[PDB]
Amino acid sequence: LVSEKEFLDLPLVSVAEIVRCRGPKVSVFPFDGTRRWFHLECNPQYDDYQQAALRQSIRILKMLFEHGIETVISPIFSGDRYIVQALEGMALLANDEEILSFYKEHEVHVLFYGDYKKRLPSTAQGAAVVKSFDDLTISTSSNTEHRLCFGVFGNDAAESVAQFSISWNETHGKPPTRREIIEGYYGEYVDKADMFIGFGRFSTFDFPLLSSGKTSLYFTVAPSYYMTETTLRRILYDHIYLRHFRPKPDYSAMSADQLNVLRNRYRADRVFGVGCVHDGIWFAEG
Amino acid sequence: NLVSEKEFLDLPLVSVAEIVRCRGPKVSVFPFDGTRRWFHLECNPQYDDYQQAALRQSIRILKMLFEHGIETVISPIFSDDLIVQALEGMALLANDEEILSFYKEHEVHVLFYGDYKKRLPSTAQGAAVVKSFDDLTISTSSNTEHRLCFGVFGNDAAESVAQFSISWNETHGKPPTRREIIEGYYGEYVDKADMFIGFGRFSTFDFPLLSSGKTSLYFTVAPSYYMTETTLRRILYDHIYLRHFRPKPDYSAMSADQLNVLRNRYRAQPDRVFGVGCVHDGIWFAEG
């Protein structure tokens, strides 16, 4: 029984306790539109993309964890032979000092999911990235306050599940349960996503097995890196108090006039996700 | 392909259907949602019958979708991630004269997917309904104009996939490919969903294996049954012409002002988020 203004005025710790009580326990947050943001808020002539971007990802993950969210799932990647570059960008997640300090300071256990072992190049660099992912999962394994799952080619889990399940049944004598399948794919058991925060065109991606009809979807207008505290709070408020508001509507107990308002509104077309294009850029209308 | 929204709206139906056939959405997911509300608003709950009304509207809409050139419609009917009443409803979908007449007239091939075999009552009635699903799939298998996939507890395919894959390896000596996994789950190979049209609260559900980042998501304000021809055309237009506009943005090639309009927009309206709603009399509505 909290209003939005009240929720906005709460001290941070109260918000965190509410989130631990009611969720979202598992939040999906790809960092999207990093391109556009980099051209708008940095200097592309002087600044370097990878470091700036990493700084912002750190800021947002910090914010999410500090709001009492236990697990963040963050799909990162899904010319050519600029692959060296992008393998270095992946490498930052396991070697950059600032982010390692972040994992330490916030007691984050980092896990990687997806088809990266087979899809990454069979080069010494590719092998090095994979090995640094493995090693990072091991060296953060003593952390238990938060879980961060990074998705690298984490889009089509069907074949991976098929093979995991064949092996499992061969060594256990029965199929793996859903929990066991999830543990196999993410490394540890993770609950279904409570929310997905996307950007721009309405679409979701790269959290196999964890999607449900109870996953709340949001789409920012600005690139993810513009995410402010106020915004995160309006999202949290919507998911916690409004998405599953009780009691459910009782149409029979509604006056003739209320029913008239609903009837008239629905009769006189409005659909979220229908957009417009300006200078080659899509914007949601409304 | 240089077509405006007004132009697209003014096109003859066959032109639209041909465009949809050419450019998609080939596979469209469309649950019928907000049906209690729709029924209390557009029918006489005191005189009218719920199921006939609802079925009539579902037929109307599926008809509209197929008439717009969409090959496959996937429609979650009963969802357990979102018995109780309807083992009955699905029975209607495989047994009601009007809808059977619809599958015939519109040459629809019907499939059922989900955990229904295990979730349906283990009674003779449950068995009979399952058999009628099977029989309907066989019966409409010669229909080739359209495909309709009904979701009955079609969430959480993981365990189904595990079991299918175990059996498959037992018979073939190797794991099934993705294609084979999809055939196993849906009965036939189906491509990834090109769009999902939902209602109200932004959420999607019950099309396992077929979701991708390329699935365009839409959320109507009104309950599904209010869907009109114009609304559907606006959705189609957005998906075909706007969602994947070419060329894609080249920021380094953009003028100072092209960057400025964007920067200014984001800085001057910093908290804009679609999916945040408001509640009145227990009804959630998206803001914006």
DSSP-assigned states of every residue in B102-160 = HHHHTTEEEEEESSHHHHS-SSHHHHHHHHHHHHHHHHTTT--SEEEEEEES----HHH
Is B194 an active-site residue? no
Q: What b/e sequence results for A141-154 when a residue is b if at least 16 CB atoms lie within 10 Å of its CB, and e otherwise?
A: eebeebbbbbbbbb
**Contact predicate A190/A147, CB 8 Å:** yes
How open is the CA angle A212-B193-B199, to the nearest 5 degrees? 55
For residues A243 and B203, give the distance between their C-alpha atoms in angstroms, rounded to a whole number. 10
Q: Which residue of A has its CA nearest to B177?
A: A159
Alpha-carbon torsion (B101, B102, B103, B108), positive or negative? positive
What is the experimental resolution, given in Å to one decimal place? Answer: 2.2
For residues A270 and B137, give the distance between their C-alpha atoms in angstroms, rounded to a whole number. 36
Closest CA to A23 of A207, A213, A188, A239: A239
Pick the CATH number of A1-247 from 2.60.40.10, 3.40.1180.10, 3.60.21.10, 3.40.50.2300: 3.40.1180.10
Q: Which residue of A has its CA nearest to B81?
A: A213
Q: Which of B10, B48, B49, B50 is catalytic?
A: B50
For residues A238 and A218, give the distance between their C-alpha atoms in angstroms, rounded to a whole number. 10
Burial of A210 (0-12, 13-18, 19+ CB in 10 A): buried
Supply φ then ψ for residue A102, to 5 degrees.
-60, -45
**Contact predicate A133/A112, CB 8 Å:** yes
The experimental method, as deposited, was X-ray
Under DSSP, the state recorded for B253 is G
**Contact predicate A162/A125, CB 8 Å:** no
Give how far Cα A228 sits from Cα of A243, B9, B276, Å.
21, 39, 15
Contact across the interface for B245 and A280, Cβ inside 8 Å: yes
**Contact predicate B171/B179, CB 8 Å:** no
For residues B115 and A94, give the distance between their C-alpha atoms in angstroms, rounded to a whole number. 40
Q: How far apart are the first and last CA of chain A?
A: 29
Position of tokens 């999410």?
A64
For every residue of chain A, DSSP letters joined together read: ---HHHHHHS-HHHHHHHHHHH--SEEE-----HHHHHHHHS-TTTS-HHHHHHHHHHHHHHHHHHTT--EEEEEEE---S-HHHHHHHHHHHHH-HHHHHHHHHTTEEEEEESSHHHHS-SSHHHHHHHHHHHHHHHHTTT--SEEEEEEES-S-THHHHHHHHHHHHHHHSSPPPHHHHHHHHHSS--PPPSEEEEESSS---S-TT---TT-EEEEESS-GGG--HHHHHHHHHIIIIITT-SSPP-GGGS-HHHHHHHHHHHH---EET-EEEETTEEEE--
For residues A231 and A8, give the distance between their C-alpha atoms in angstroms, rounded to a whole number. 10
Contact list in B for residue A211 (CB cut-off 8 A) is 204-205, 211
Interface size A-B, in CB pairs within 8 Å, comes to 264
For residues A224 and A267, give the distance between their C-alpha atoms in angstroms, rounded to a whole number. 35
Contact list in A for residue B238 (CB cut-off 8 A) is 273-275
For residues B193 and B214, give the distance between their C-alpha atoms in angstroms, rounded to a whole number. 8
Contact list in A for residue B276 (CB cut-off 8 A) is 218, 234-235, 237-238
**Contact predicate B74/B30, CB 8 Å:** yes
Closest CA to B276 of A63, A247, A236, A273: A236
Of B41, B258, B275, the CB nearest to A263: B41
Cβ-based neighbours of A54, under 8 Å, separated by 6 or more: A92, A93, A96, A98, A99
Angle formed by the axes of helices A34-41 and B256-268, nearest 10°: 100
For residues B248 and B225, give the distance between their C-alpha atoms in angstroms, rounded to a whole number. 35
Q: Which two structure tokens, joined as six digits, stand for B226? A: 């209010």
Q: Which residue of A has its CA nearest to B173?
A: A166
Cβ-based neighbours of B126, under 8 Å, separated by 6 or more: B87, B120
Give how far Cα B10 sits from Cα of A97, B1, B67, B104, B166, Å.
59, 15, 16, 30, 52
**Contact predicate A134/A187, CB 8 Å:** no
> Other C-beta atoms within 10 Å of B230: how many?
10
The partner residues of A74 in beta bridges, in order of sequence, read A150
Contact list in B for residue A203 (CB cut-off 8 A) is 213-217
Amino acid at B205: F
Of A78, A234, A271, the CB nearest to B234: A271
> Other C-beta atoms within 10 Å of A9: how many?
10
For residues A209 and A195, give the distance between their C-alpha atoms in angstroms, rounded to a whole number. 14
Q: Which of A22, A36, A226, A238 is catalytic?
A: A36
Q: Which two structure tokens, joined as six digits, stand for B76? A: 């979650």
Contact across the interface for A272 and B226, Cβ inside 8 Å: no
Contact list in A for residue B225 (CB cut-off 8 A) is none
Residue B197 C-alpha from the chain's centroid: 6
Closest CA to B60 of B102, B10, B14, B15: B102
* Distance between A281 CA and the closest CA of chain B, angstroms: 7
Is A36 an active-site residue? yes
Supply φ then ψ for residue A120, to 5 degrees.
-65, 150
For residues A116 and A77, give the distance between their C-alpha atoms in angstroms, rounded to a whole number. 10
Contact list in A for residue B42 (CB cut-off 8 A) is 263
* Distance between A216 CA and the closest CA of chain B, angstroms: 6
Say if strands B273-274 and B216-220 run parallel, antiparallel, or are unpaired: unpaired
Q: Which of A49, A218, A226, A241 is catalytic?
A: A49
For residues A199 and A33, give the distance between their C-alpha atoms in angstroms, rounded to a whole number. 7
* Distance between B213 CA and the closest CA of chain A, angstroms: 5
The partner residues of B109 in beta bridges, in order of sequence, read B147
Is A241 an active-site residue? no
Of A245, A258, A274, the CB nearest to B279: A245
Residue B206 C-alpha from the chain's centroid: 9
Q: Which of A46, A80, A81, A82 is catalytic?
A: A82
Position of tokens 């365990």?
B159
For residues A254 and B224, give the distance between their C-alpha atoms in angstroms, rounded to a whole number. 21
